[PDB]
């Protein structure tokens, strides 16, 4: 049990109003304890020497147990595969790539809410980019269709799923609707797919070999943003800026629990990194993005990467 100082208290009061919270007197006390505990972890981290900084955000009054139950996958997915189809060509590759800068090729940052549906945002993000790169038309595709309808490809709505499986669903389903006709609800609903309203389509699915991080480099450089999954741990939730890395996350496919979208890569002070779009809204991290160290299979990010070839 912590002794909470008045600085922490006054900041928790502001945080509650900013995030529109109400607590009973008895839950307020437990929430304040978690907030103060995170406050000190953030300060202790930022006051030391690290390649990334932490900060307060929408998760700051939650324990990681609660975060995991509400926001991350509730079960491991079938990330491990003994077969793939992507075969890498030859380097070297550009020193840095950023599909956000090449043109209008990356959609705005979205918010998955209290639902483990990040695999659906990773999927729509990758396909939105692919269609924009191929046609100059930037769409916004319906994550909720994947949440509600993609179960025949071993996806599980708000419990989790995989981009490669979702790309196959879109391929065999003959398309995905837009956000405009199938709006996002942040919970498991009834499938409302209408064939004549599909606006995005998949021709092929590229699966990158397990641990083949260099093929990810090539695919981002040459073709498309790349969907991938990694293991989120407690420190990552409070990521603010810089190059994320961790010595406690695992690197294996059975431990990944969060899907995202690599939109580029670079290097800073000798440290290679990935530029990654998240789905926790534009005020998380670096305007909704994070950097994560490249070349080390960091947190298992090279375990099951994939991207689509659009039918246009
Ligand atoms: C990259 O990674 C992904 C994800 O793991 C792999 O995805 C699998 O992809 C295969 C295709 O390569 C998918 O299999 C196909 O599914 C279609 C739909 O199946 C449903 O509907 C049929 C009725 O139409 C039901 O019988 C079935 O039980 C499902 O409910 C089928 O229409 C396909 O059948 C056609 O091709 C097969 C080839 O085996 C023939 O046997 C058939 O006669 C028919 O012509 C086919 O079965 C599979 O669903 C995907 N799995 C998942 C979990 O998403 C990719 O394979 C992988 N890519 C590579 C290259 O490895
Ligand atoms: C991982 O893949 C396996 C094999 O495709 C899935 O197991 C199948 O699950 C379906 C639906 O639950 C059953 O109808 C099949 O009989 C199962 N087959 C086998 C061989 O077990 C499994 O559900 C997938 N796991 C996840 C998390 O999606």
Residue numbers in the entry: 2 to 313
Can you list sentences taken from the study reporting this PDB entry?
Cathepsin H is a lysosomal cysteine protease of the papain superfamily involved in protein degradation. For preventing premature activation, cysteine proteases are synthesized as inactive proenzymes called zymogens that contain a prodomain and a mature (catalytic) domain, and the removal of the prodomain leads to the activation of the enzymes. Upon activation, cathepsin H displays a distinct proteolytic activity among the papain superfamily, functioning predominantly as an aminopeptidase that cleaves a single N-terminal residue from a polypeptide chain. Unique among papain-like cysteine proteases, the mini-chain (the octapeptide EPQNCSAT from the prodomain) remains bound to cathepsin H through a disulfide bond and is essential for the aminopeptidase activity.
Purified procathepsin H protein was not autoprocessed under the acidic crystallization condition and we were able to determine the crystal structure of procathepsin H at 2.00 Å resolution. Procathepsin H was well defined in the electron density map as a single polypeptide chain comprised of an N-terminal prodomain (Ala1P-Pro93P) and a C-terminal mature domain (Tyr1-Val220) with a disulfide bridge between Cys212 and the mini-chain Cys80P. bLigand/ion in the structure of procathepsin H: N-acetyl-D-glucosamine, β-D-mannopyranose, α-D-mannopyranose, sulfate ion, glycerol. Glycans could be assigned unambiguously in procathepsin H for the two glycosylation sites, Asn79P on the mini-chain of the prodomain and Asn115 on the mature domain. Cys26 is oxidized to S-oxy cysteine and adopts two alternative conformations in our crystal structure of procathepsin H. The oxidation may have happened during purification or crystallization as no reducing agent was present to preserve the formation of all disulfide bonds. The sidechain of His166 adopts an active orientation in procathepsin H with Nδ interacting with the sulfur of Cys26 at a distance of 3.1 Å and Nε interacting with Oδ of Asn186 at a distance of 2.8 Å, compared with cathepsin H where His166 was not involved in any interaction with Cys26 or Asn186 due to crystal packing. However, these three catalytic residues in procathepsin H are shielded by a group of hydrophobic residues Tyr72P, Leu73P, Trp74P from the prodomain, which effectively blocks the access to the catalytic Cys and prevents external substrates from entering the binding site. Structural comparison with cathepsin H revealed that the mini-chain in procathepsin H runs in the direction opposite to that of the substrates while the mini-chain in cathepsin H follows the substrate binding direction, suggesting that the negatively charged C-terminal carboxyl group in the mini-chain of cathepsin H is positioned to interact with the N-terminal amino group of the substrate whereas the cleaved mini-chain in procathepsin H needs to reorient to be involved in such interaction.
